[PDB]
Amino acid sequence: SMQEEDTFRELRIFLRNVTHRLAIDKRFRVFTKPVDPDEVPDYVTVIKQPMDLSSVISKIDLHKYLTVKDYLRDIDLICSNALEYNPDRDPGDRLIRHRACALRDTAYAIIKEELDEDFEQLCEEIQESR
């Protein structure tokens, strides 16, 4: 219905807003474009589902997230790809691992403070009925 649209438009705007607060943050700059294949050749062999804040944005715009839960799962993938790819054997590794976790935990904290539970519930029921 019209009212379902209203709801997803509202969702999309909230998701853009969150992604961009993540993206302007200095610590998270390295998550704002795809790991470049030509510049990191074996990434693709280890990491099967690549994800970064730019492709999250396109996905919002192509209406791929009907819930916040689905959006969070993609932010979580950004983090876990990074923990999975990066060895954990020194301070640079340590820096990047800490930023991935920070990204993930910052996304949760923002959603948690700002997302009305009745709004997400309504998003979930609309998806469950499709």
Swiss-Prot record:
Transmembrane segments: none annotated. Residues 108-130 form a coiled coil. Induction: Up-regulated in breast, uterus, colon, ovary, and stomach tumors. Induced in breast cancer cells overexpressing NCOA3 or treated with estrogen. Down-regulated in 5-fluorouracil-resistant derivatives of the colon cancer cell line HCT 116. It is found in: Nucleus. Highly expressed in estrogen receptor positive breast tumors and in osteosarcoma tumors. Belongs to the AAA ATPase family. May be a transcriptional coactivator of the nuclear receptor ESR1 required to induce the expression of a subset of estradiol target genes, such as CCND1, MYC and E2F1. May play a role in the recruitment or occupancy of CREBBP at some ESR1 target gene promoters. May be required for histone hyperacetylation. Involved in the estrogen-induced cell proliferation and cell cycle progression of breast cancer cells. Interacts with ESR1 and NCOA3 and these interactions are enhanced by estradiol. Interacts with acetylated lysine residues on histone H1.4, H2A, H2B and H3 (in vitro). This is ATPase family AAA domain-containing protein 2. The chain holds residues 981 to 1108 of 1390 of the full protein.
